[PDB]
Ligand binder design. Structure first.
Ligand SMILES: [Cu+2]
Length: 120
């Protein structure tokens, strides 16, 4: 299945900010507003996943196959808290590593909230 995640100004937000998908699903990240991208956060993707970083203002499609939680950021707006979470499958095995990851404060508060929203 195919999902969209939009980057929007309300520094902006990922909408949805938390997203659960199954292994093999695809997410397209779409910067509706200018100035945004998506990039994985170091230490916040599961084993077997590849890091990725899209170009500013480009639509970027990722097929998610490795299970676990993925923390993602907009590269320039990371410090302001523009971040999201994609969870692949139902019982993520990397939760300890991701909860241990250091982030800017505002990024941490949003990451924590997105994780909570997904039941973790
Ligand atoms: Cu941004």
């Amino acid at each position: 299945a195919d999902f969209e995640v939009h980057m929007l100004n309300k520094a902006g937000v990922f909408e949805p900010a938390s997203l659960k998908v199954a292994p093999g699903d695809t997410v397209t990240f779409i910067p509706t507003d200018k100035g945004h991208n998506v990039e994985t956060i170091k230490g916040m993707i599961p084993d077997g996943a590849e890091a990725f970083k899209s170009k500013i203002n480009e639509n970027y499609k990722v097929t998610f196959t490795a299970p676990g939680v993925y923390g993602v950021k907009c590269t320039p707006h990371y410090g302001m808290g523009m971040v999201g979470v994609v969870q692949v499958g139902d019982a993520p095995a990397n939760l300890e590593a991701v909860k241990g990851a250091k982030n800017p404060k505002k990024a941490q508060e949003r990451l924590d909230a997105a994780l909570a929203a997904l039941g973790n």
